[PDB]
Design a protein around this ligand. Structure first.
Ligand code: 9EZ
Ligand code: 9EZ
Lengths: 195, 195
């Protein structure tokens, strides 16, 4: 609410980090390396962004990423297609979303219906090389399925602010070279903190 | 030109990384740590971004950052104030720019008039804690003065894609905890690469 923008901003930061590998590049530079070929990245302009959850945060991510020329599609069981259309997000059924996306971000509560929203079965329906962001709640993305998808290349990268357990006891995702992460920083701004 | 968007995207990446310390945070996570308090960040909405150089890349950065609610001001010796106004950048003389900015980004060629455009003198005229980006040409920002500004806290952070020497032989900037960096990745996208 106060914190809608802090979360939305982080999410968009994570999207740009996935496209360009800024965290990995910084660590390479700090280790004395100059690795130009390794961190060849991708332009966001023209790419499809799937937004799952079209409440305040989802809407704010949408309008920021639209300024980059991203095509913004999404799903929400509750928000009307008229409302989402008013902020430029084309709503489609989930099964239609998966194959279209270059990026996917999640902006849902953690409910039975949203736990492992992204799992083995939904990763299989994505475009190969999809990139995924979870700055919402840990568990929305099944962590085992994400690791399997990163191992195969089915997922090319992921940005995680939240984890099923916090801090995560299993370090395989954090340790993966194509994973960027923060210690649940989504509301951690000076501004969000004072209403 | 092809590559205007690749550069502009990287610059906006670096702005978001400075606000939220995403590269540092990822390193912290990869080192096994969960340091939430340490990486308290800042919201971009409502902040002032100064854009020095209002050509194609500067413009594109402007319109993207404007979607985050940033106030975009700037300076260019060639572009008229009515023209910059038409893409939402308020032009002011340089001396007026320094004290207003929360973030500064440079988008100039490397000329005598732009080498060390940011130096000891212009850092002193900035707001304490200014954050700086150079995704343009190495040397626009005086590297020595930038280090001194980071050491004093006058500059709270910097993001560098380019260096006076590449790879940089002097490692003090790169190694600083508030500096994020890439190995000259501004045009390093699959898309920019094929015209
Ligand atoms: C109850 N509920 N469910 C969602 C949802 C679930 C799956 C995908 C997108 C959105 C959002 C809310 N508030
Ligand atoms: C020739 N020139 N000079 C600049 C400049 C100079 C000082 C400050 C900001 C921008 C940009 C271009 N194209």
């Amino acid at each position: 609410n106060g914190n809608s923008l802090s979360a939305a901003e982080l999410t968009c930061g994570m999207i740009m980090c996935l496209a360009r590998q800024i965290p990995q590049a910084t660590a390479s530079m700090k280790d004395g390396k100059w690795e130009r070929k390794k961190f060849m990245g991708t332009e966001l302009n023209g790419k499809t962004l799937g937004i799952l959850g079209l409440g305040r945060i989802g809407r704010e991510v949408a309008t920021r990423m639209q300024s980059f020329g991203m095509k913004t599609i999404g799903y929400d069981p509750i928000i009307s297609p008229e409302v989402s259309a008013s902020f430029g997000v084309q709503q489609l059924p989930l099964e239609e979303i998966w194959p279209l996306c270059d990026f996917i971000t999640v902006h849902t509560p953690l409910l039975p219906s949203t736990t492992g929203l992204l799992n083995d079965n939904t990763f299989a329906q994505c475009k190969k090389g999809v990139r995924v962001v979870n700055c919402a709640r840990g568990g929305i993305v099944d962590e085992g399925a994400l690791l399997r998808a990163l191992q195969s290349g089915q997922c090319a990268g992921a940005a995680l602010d939240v984890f099923t357990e916090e801090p995560p006891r299993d370090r395989a995702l954090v340790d993966h070279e194509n994973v960027i992460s923060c210690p649940h920083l989504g509301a951690s701004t000076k501004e969000a903190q004072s209403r």
